[PDB]
Each structure stands twice: as C-alpha cells, then as structure tokens.
Amino acid sequence: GIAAGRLAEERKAWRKNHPFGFIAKPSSNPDGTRNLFIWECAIPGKKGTIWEGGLYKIRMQFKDDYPSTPPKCKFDPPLFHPNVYPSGTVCLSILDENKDWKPSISVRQLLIGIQDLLTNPNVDDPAQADAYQIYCQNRVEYEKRVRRQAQQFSAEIVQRQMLDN
C-alpha cells in the first residue's frame, strides 16, 4: 500500500532522529500490532516561552490515500490557543491539501509547524473566539492562562499518562 509504505518510512526516520522532547508513535492494535494509520504524538512547549514545561498531546489520523491527503491532526485534550478550534483541530495551511500541504512533508515537519503556531499565533486565522480575543486585547491574561495550561499539562504528568496507555 502506498500509504503504509510511506508511514513505515516516516516511523523509521522519526526513530532515527527527531527533535528533543517530541513524541510521535503509531498506536497499537489490541494484540500489540502496530497501527500505522493512527499516531499518538506530543509537542513540548518551546523553551524560553510561556509554553515551556508543557507537553501537548496530539493525535494524527491518516487516510488510505496519504500522502495525497495530510493526516487529520487533533489536540486531545483541546488546547487554549487562538488557532486551535474548540474541538482540538488546528487552523494551519500545511494541513490542507487544497492550500499548502504537499505529499513530501514529513511528520517531523508537521509537528514542528504546529509547535511554531503555538508559539506564534496567526491573527488572520482565528479558530476560537475567546482565546483569540484575549490574545489580541488582554495579553497579560493570555500569558497567565497559557502558563497555567503548561502546568496543567506538565511534561511529567502527560508522559505518565502516555506510558500508562
């Protein structure tokens, strides 16, 4: 299968070298077999930012026509951020085949791109009204909420959950 072949390549590349603190792993079927089409991932908050210390779990679901189509990416649980929808999906052009997705983009590039969005909101792409308004009009409150969220989803807490899965 085209998708399965590429997904095995992505797994190998990720295991060989990936950015420190990130997680990206195919899930497991009931019996322990690898399911290449659903990955459980997590993005660390960027060091030196209000996101630091947090680890933000995100699921990738691939269709059979990947890499024509990008995976569906969804933060779980949903995150407070101007460009993350209340459902946890993300407003980001590289995640849309009809905008800036192209088949060569790697899992690493997706997760780095999403991290960059966390750090640097796009004020042209509001996805949730309250986070967007607070970001634009009450930055002190924005930063308080993001710092509290980084503690709520601390690396130690979140890693323990992921190991307990």
The dihedral through the CA atoms of 115, 116, 119, 124 has a sign that is negative
d(CA 54, CA 153): 5
Which residues on adjacent β-strands are paired with residue 119? none
1-165 is classed in which CATH architecture? Roll (3.10)
Answer positive or negative: Cα dihedral of 16, 21, 28, 2. Answer: negative
Radius of gyration, alpha carbons of the chain: 16
Phi, psi values for residue 142, rounded to 5°: -50, -50
Residue 129 has φ and ψ, to the nearest 5°, of -60, -45
First to last CA, the chain: 28
For residue 62, which phi and psi values (nearest 5 degrees)? -100, 140
Q: Locate 90 and state its tokens.
A: 């993300």
Look at residues 61, 58, 14, 56 and name the one whose alpha carbon lies nearest to residue 36: 61
Spell out the domain ranges in the chain.
1-165
What is the C-alpha separation between 75 and 23, in angstroms, rounded? 13
Query: Tokens 């991290």 appear where?
Result: 115
Residue numbers annotated as active site: 91
For this entry, resolution in Å reads 1.7
Strand partners, 26: 39
- Contact indicator for 59, 40 with CB cutoff of 8 Å: yes
Tell me whether residue 53 is exposed, middle or buried, using C-beta atoms within 10 angstroms of its C-beta: 0 to 12, 13 to 18, 19 or more: middle
Elucidation technique: X-ray
Hey, CA dihedral for 62, 118, 116, 160, is it positive or negative? negative
Helix-then-strand count for the chain, H and E: 5, 4
Residue 78: both structure tokens together: 């949903």
Distance CA 31, CA 91 (A): 35
Q: Which residues pair with 34 in a beta bridge?
A: 28
Query: Please, what's the b/e burial string for 108-143 (b: 16 or more CB within 10 A of its CB; e: otherwise)?
Result: bebbebbbebbeebeeeebbbeebbebbeeeeeebe
CA distance 81 to 54: 13
What pairs with residue 28 in β-bridges? Answer: 34
- How far apart, in whole angstroms, are the C-alpha atoms of residue 41 and residue 22? 7
H or E segment to which residue 23 belongs: strand 23-28
Three-state SS across 55-113?
EEEEEEECCCCCCCCCCEEEECCCCCCCCECCCCEECCHHHCCCCCCCCCCCHHHHHHH
